[PDB]
């Protein structure tokens, strides 16, 4: 029989000399041991081809060698101990010397293969390593690099790691990359690359909803907000794809996902003292006709709110901020919303958060002066308040439109 | 429709397979009988072949035509060693030796038009009519040779080599198993 | 047993769902058996007649198990197909109407790596398909577009092909395609990426020498020879890299390599024209102090004269170029040849030409006023005339000395 960690073992000597990608391994592995043990029938029987395949086939997960660490592991170990070091040559960061550029990006030109290339534990571990010790290098190397050729491949290196794990999400979170991140933003919006990447890490950055320290809204408080505002009202000259206004919608709805409330809210009093919001209000609406959340880019399992949901019902939370919407904009805001109220099921999260966002309209916008849909709400919301169904947020669901009534009398009355 | 087609199929003159032996005014030896006539199927394809490239339609009315295709076909592989000359001394120098080679007759595999020539035979058909397309191909060469190049200054003229690329009906004697 | 084909059937299976490199493919195929067999030798019995199977060049390399065509081969066809159906649609390709540029540089990108990821001996085939019309037809569509996103990838595919097969070079050089970019070098300045790249295809299929049609001279000649001297000499302002200048030194040497006879050469009309040439001058020289040959880039059989000893041996056939110089790099000139041929041991071809460039150098320019490195010179003449080894180049070599001492006895110590 066949040492029983053969498999372990092919699994990185493929990717030694092939240089495939980890997932494309498992294949290239599982193609060639597949194809033999069918044309050479004499060697299925003998436990050798069927054990290569069961190898292969870890109990759940399992790459674990007979012996010394992977080659991946290796380069992971000689690529954050050079950084590590080049971070804290006091002597050659300022006041530099020999010409280290070029060997730099070759090192985060590796490092970026690796977490892209490699098996996820073996990254994972390895950041996690002495409680996030060289995730916080780069981010301390970042913030005083600056060179913008090398900047931008840290920046994609941060990418690759947010969608590693939470934690490195939350430890980025914590960290000073992102108030350096609307700093540089702010004030140099020359490189339409690195201000795209910037845009994007921080709705990467964010998308986990957690708090951060107070000292980040010096920066990460209105007057970004107003910035942000300003490049989806009108744009930068340089942003000849037109991408800028897609990814700065996506990080006005990233930055309030964790923000408790309306009334205190950074963002929302940047609407509120903003000129005009034509543009921002229309593209709000077409995220919300679809119903889809741009923020959840990564598959981790904790998932916070519907972050356009969350986002209105913050905007509606105040009459200052329910006057971003022209007419025939919030004409078109309750015809979806009516709509999506409808067509979900019982015992859906996110019925109960269009159910609130009606609540929200309901109860700040001029609605009963124009009552633009109301037969077709009261309606629904007769079958909402009727429905015997019994799981404990359909429950939710027949309280809040029990609140909404109570509130508003013309709900729930009779059909004209 | 109507492509230009070969005039002097005389009913004296022999066939061998499917190609008509014609007359050839010329001093390389061969089978055939010395022409005396001005015009010459040599001459019927070269005067012709300027005109003749352009159609994408050819019906065979006998084996004169089948012989007279054969030397635009020809013609238009002759231009392709002439137009790198340098000076007509090279080009006339240079088509001799182009003649020569052992090019595939009617049914010998690579021949380009196979439906439509038969093999010959036997020994006294085949070795004549190898006897007479060789000394068809050195003449055709020399009679380019003598008015593509330019008195001026021997430059194989624009006017004649613009034709290279435009092979009769995409028929290639090189034919295509190479 | 083995079923014997078992090796072709497994290295096309893993490139199909990998997308490996055909070599990496190859090794992948070799490590895995080879590690198992290794782990339990008594798979040798089935593993040991695999690898063996696998251990093909083109003797039946790629044997089908029956009837089946390689991934590789089938995208080929489809794509030199399409290529060609769209060639010939002469009412999009003069009176545009669809959006045609995303498909094409979608099937030009997929080309591309297929010349380059698989076997080579299938991308051979499908290009001489059919007297090389999948080659020609590609040709034409590139005279004819005038996309400068669709132009450049179409470049990088003539190069890969062009590195296939000295066939295939020789049909390119034939083509239309060598006047096109030199056409488009000389009005299109301002595509700096274009440019070079054109600079590198076009001396990319001269590098084999072959005789060119003469309407190509109409554009290729003296006008567009002074037009890359100037590009050497004084640069582009929009180069940054400086690749031009190299770039522009290789492709005068490749096409310089296939001329003839010296006095009529087109190349050497615009030296003597050209208005103090220099950085031209002292590029060269570097080149022959190391003594490689930038023109030699692929590996095709019948190797082609060295290039550069070519285009000097050229240079100083006349006096009017032999002037070019500086009187300080020609003292370097006359040191650097007298090394090499003092250096080289008996018989190497290369012994003969630099002989034969310092035969030229003494004939046309003022040698004997100035007499450098002459008693060296003398000596190893001295020698090689004395050398008693019997092999032709080594005769060859003994004979030139003969020839050129006898026109210059002052070379024989009289």
């Known amino acids: 029989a066949v040492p029983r960690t053969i498999g372990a073992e092919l699994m990185e000597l ?5 240089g495939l990608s980890h997932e494309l391994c498992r294949v290239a592995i ?33 790459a674990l060698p007979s012996g010394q660490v992977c080659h991946d592991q290796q380069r992971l170990e000689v690529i954050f101990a050079d950084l590590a070091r080049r971070k804290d040559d006091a002597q050659q960061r ?4 020999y010409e280290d550029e070029g060997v730099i990006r070759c090192y985060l030109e590796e490092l970026l293969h690796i977490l892209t290339d490699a098996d996820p534990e073996v990254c994972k571990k390895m950041c996690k390593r002495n409680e996030f010790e060289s995730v916080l290098a780069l981010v301390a190397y970042y913030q005083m690099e600056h060179r913008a050729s090398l900047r931008l491949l840290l920046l994609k290196c941060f990418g690759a790691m947010c969608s590693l794990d939470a934690a490195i999400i939350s430890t ?34 964010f998308s986990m909803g957690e708090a951060v320290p107070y000292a980040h809204y010096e920066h990460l408080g209105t007057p970004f907000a107003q910035f942000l505002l300003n490049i989806v009202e009108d744009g930068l000259p340089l942003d000849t794809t037109e991408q800028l206004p897609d990814l ?23 609407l509120s003292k903003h000129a005009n919001v034509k543009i921002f209000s229309e593209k709000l609406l077409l995220l919300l006709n679809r119903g889809d959340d741009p923020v959840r880019i990564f598959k981790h399992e904790p998932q916070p709110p519907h972050s356009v949901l969350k986002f209105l019902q913050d905007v509606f939370g105040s009459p200052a901020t329910a006057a971003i919407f022209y007419h025939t904009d919030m004409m078109a805001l309750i015809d979806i919303t009516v709509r999506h109220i409808a067509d979900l099921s019982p015992g859906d999260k996110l019925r109960m958060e269009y159910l609130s966002l009606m609540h929200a309209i309901v109860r700040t916008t001029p609605y009963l002066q124009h009552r633009h849909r109301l037969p077709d709400l009261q309606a629904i919301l007769r079958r909402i308040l009727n429905e015997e169904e019994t799981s404990p947020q359909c429950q939710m669901d027949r309280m809040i439109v029990r609140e909404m009534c109570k509130e508003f009398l013309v709900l729930g009355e009779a059909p004209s | 429709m109507p492509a230009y087609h070969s005039s002097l199929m005389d009913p004296d003159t022999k066939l061998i397979g499917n190609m008509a ?9 061969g089978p055939a009988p010395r022409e005396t006539k001005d015009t010459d199927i040599v001459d019927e394809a070269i005067y012709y072949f300027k005109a003749n490239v352009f159609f994408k339609n050819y019906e065979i009315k006998n084996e004169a035509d089948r012989t007279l295709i054969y030397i635009t076909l020809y013609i238009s592989e002759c231009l392709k060693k002439l137009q790198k000359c340098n000076s007509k001394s090279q080009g006339e120098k ?14 010998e595999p690579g021949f ?20 007479y397309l060789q000394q068809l191909r050195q003449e055709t060469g020399l009679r380019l040779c003598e008015k593509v190049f330019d008195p001026q200054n021997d430059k194989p003229s624009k006017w004649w080599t613009c034709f290279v690329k435009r092979q009769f009906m995409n028929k290639s004697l090189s034919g295509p198993g190479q």
Request: glycine content about 4%.
């Open chain 1, 172 to 205: 980025l979170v914590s960290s000073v990359l992102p108030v350096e991140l609307a700093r540089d933003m702010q004030t140099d919006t020359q490189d339409h690359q690195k201000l795209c990447y910037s845009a994007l890490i921080l709705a990467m950055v």
């Open chain 1, 94 to 97: 300022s006041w530099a010397l």
């Open chain 1, 248 to 270: 700065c919608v996506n990080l006005l709805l990233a930055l309030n996902l964790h923000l408790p409330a309306a009334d205190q809210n950074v963002i929302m009093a940047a």
């Open chain 2, 112 to 131: 380009p038009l196979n439906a439509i020539y038969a093999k010959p035979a036997n020994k006294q058909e085949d070795e004549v009519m190898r006897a």
């Open chain 2, 21 to 29: 032996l014609l007359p050839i005014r010329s001093q390389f030896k």
């Open chain 2, 94 to 107: 240079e088509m001799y030796t182009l003649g020569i080679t052992n090019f595939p007759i009617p049914g």
């Open chain 1, 30 to 62: 599982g193609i060639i041991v597949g194809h033999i043990q069918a044309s050479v029938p004499a060697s299925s029987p003998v436990m050798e081809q069927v054990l290569l395949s069961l190898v292969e086939g870890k109990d759940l997960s399992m």
């Open chain 1, 14 to 18: 493929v990717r030694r000399n092939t």
